[PDB]
Amino acid sequence: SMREYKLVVLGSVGVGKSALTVQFVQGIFVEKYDPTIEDSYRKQVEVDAQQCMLEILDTAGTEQFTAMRDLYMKNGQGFALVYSITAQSTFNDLQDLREQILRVKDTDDVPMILVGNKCDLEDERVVGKEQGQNLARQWNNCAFLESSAKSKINVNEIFYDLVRQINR
Amino acid sequence: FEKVRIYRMDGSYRSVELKHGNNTTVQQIMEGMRLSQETQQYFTIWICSENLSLQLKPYHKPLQHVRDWPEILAELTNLDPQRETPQLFLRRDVRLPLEVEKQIEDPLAILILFDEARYNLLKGFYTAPDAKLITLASLLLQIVYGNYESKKHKQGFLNEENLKSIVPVTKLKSKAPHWTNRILHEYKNLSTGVSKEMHHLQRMFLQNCWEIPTYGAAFFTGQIFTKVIPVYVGVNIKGLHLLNMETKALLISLKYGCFMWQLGDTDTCFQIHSMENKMSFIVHTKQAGLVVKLLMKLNGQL
Numbered sequence: 456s457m458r459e460y461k462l463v464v465l466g467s468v469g470v471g472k473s474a475l476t477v478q479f480v481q482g483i484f485v486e487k488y489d490p491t492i493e494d495s496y497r498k499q500v501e502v503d504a505q506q507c508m509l510e511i512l513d514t515a516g517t518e519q520f521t522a523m524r525d526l527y528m529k530n531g532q533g534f535a536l537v538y539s540i541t542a543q544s545t546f547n548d549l550q551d552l553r554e555q556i557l558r559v560k561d562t563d564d565v566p567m568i569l570v571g572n573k574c575d576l577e578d579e580r581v582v583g584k585e586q587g588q589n590l591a592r593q594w595n596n597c598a599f600l601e602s603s604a605k606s607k608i609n610v611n612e613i614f615y616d617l618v619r620q621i622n623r
Numbered sequence: 624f625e626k627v628r629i630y631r632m633d634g635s636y637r638s639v640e641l642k643h644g645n646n647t648t649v650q651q652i653m654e655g656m657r658l659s660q661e662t663q664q665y666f667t668i669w670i671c672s673e674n675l676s677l678q679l680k681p682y683h684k685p686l687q688h689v690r691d692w693p694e695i696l697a698e699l700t701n702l703d704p705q706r707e708t709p710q711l712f713l714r715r716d717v718r719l720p721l722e723v724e725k726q727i728e729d730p731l732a733i734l735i736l737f738d739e740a741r742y743n744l745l746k747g748f749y750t751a752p753d754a755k756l757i758t759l760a761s762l763l764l765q766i767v768y769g770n771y772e773s774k775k776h777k778q779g780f781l782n783e784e785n786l787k788s789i790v791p792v793t794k795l796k797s798k799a800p801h802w803t804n805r806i807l808h809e810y811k812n813l814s815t816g817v818s819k820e821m822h823h824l825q826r827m828f829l830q831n832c833w834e835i836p837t838y839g840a841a842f843f844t845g846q847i848f849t850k851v852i853p854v855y856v857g858v859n860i861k862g863l864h865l866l867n868m869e870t871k872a873l874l875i876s877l878k879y880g881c882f883m884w885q886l887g888d889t890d891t892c893f894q895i896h897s898m899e900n901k902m903s904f905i906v907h908t909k910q911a912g913l914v915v916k917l918l919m920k921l922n923g924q925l
């Protein structure tokens with residue numbers, strides 16, 4: 456039967472976690488955005504010749520909803536840690552998320568990908584691609600992509616990469 | 624802080640804050656969805672369990688209905704106490720006129736309508752000729768697997784596991800395994816003019832469902848006597864439909880203006896008379912009042 460994958464999208468407010476998830480799942484991108492408490496999406500995809508059922512949790516970017524946060528990390532199989540290349544503060548915030556996940560899983564062997572979103576807004580770039588790479592490397596050569604929900608750059612790849620990691 | 628999950632038929636949900644606790648209304652909850660002011664008018668909140676799915680009104684307070692479900696069940700059904708907790712769903716408003724739906728172009732509305740229609744198809748609630756079911760299956764293939772590739776799909780692809788995702792469960796073991804070649808050919812031709820963009824494909828699926836007579840129906844439960852037969856009573860913008868509960872077979876389909884209804888003694892049954900063939904039947908159900916109220920409203924909007 457078709458295997459199911461519990462994916463979790465984490466990161467600070469406004470980085471594009473919802474935009475990335477909705478672009479991936481529904482193929483929609485609009486400038487308009489609605490704030491998120493907790494949304495779950497489902498999508499069937501093919502990864503490495505195999506049909507996969509993805510369940511993607513789109514989270515609040517805030518320390519609110521602690522019960523949810525602890526539960527995300529307990530149940531999540533793979534985690535996308537998203538920041539915006541236009542906002543230094545969102546890049547800075549990802550370190551504690553990373554440490555929390557490893558603490559809950561009690562292993563550094565967790566499917567994870569570091570995502571630098573909004574890569575289409577080059578004129579407002581604050582976080583250098585080399586810095587994103589530098590962080591990923593610091594994180595035991597964790598996977599790393601720059602993405603754009605708007606232009607559909609690396610959107611699918613984010614979820615596909617997590618699935619491949621889970622399959623290992 | 625309090626919130627609620629609002630599900631859709633595919634298992635997805637969106638959490639919405641309850642700013643007034645259990646006193647929060649359907650209207651206020653609808654504001655927390657991702658819909659626009661325009662597209663909210665296509666959908667509303669339903670409360671659903673295995674034995675009963677009810678459309679809620681804008682002034683209703685969905686959490687109290689959840690709270691009161693045992694009492695609601697005793698009132699509307701013949702059932703003994705049940706163990707299931709209902710959930711809240713976003714679903715097509717039963718009152719949405721087909722003429723209005725046929726013009727929707729909003730991608731989010733289309734996908735939501737699409738997913739619900741797909742759900743009804745697989746569940747067996749859409750009766751249609753084989754040709755029609757085959758067209759629908761082929762579109763589902765295009766939507767999920769992308770373009771037909773002979774290498775991938777010609778042989779050893781459409782097995783029992785993935786047929787169950789493209790044809791009604793009521794056809795799955797009977798005659799679906801003889802449509803496999805017909806399904807693949809329609810899928811192929813779809814790939815080889817027609818926009819392959821996701822939302823266009825989803826609309827095409829919908830266009831094929833729009834002419835199915837039970838499309839968009841609210842379903843109630845009841846019984847008729849020939850032996851007592853448990854039935855689904857479907858009411859939609861086209862008319863009244865009766866399904867055998869067990870097999871989903873379409874027993875009766877009547878268009879507005881071709882039949883009359885009468886609510887019985889108390890809300891325990893309703894009678895239907897044909898204007899044309901002078902035949903008639905009684906449906907026993909404690910939802911008789913709800914059915915008649917809805918027949919009236921939907922007939923009334925034309």
Ligand SMILES: Nc1nc2c(ncn2[C@@H]2O[C@H](COP(=O)(O)OP(=O)(O)OP(O)(O)=S)[C@@H](O)[C@H]2O)c(=O)[nH]1
Pocket residue numbers: 466467468469470471472473474475485486487488489490491492514515516517572573574575576602603604605606
């Ligand atoms: N140009 C561009 N804009 C984007 C991109 N991703 C998101 N945005 C925009 O940024 C804004 C916030 O996106 P959103 O997806 O709501 O952030 P979030 O991370 O989901 O926000 P939150 O719930 O933690 S508060 C939206 O206006 C959205 O259109 C992108 O890749 N490129």
Ligand SMILES: [Mg+2]
Pocket residue numbers: 472473474489490491513514
């Ligand atoms: Mg969000």
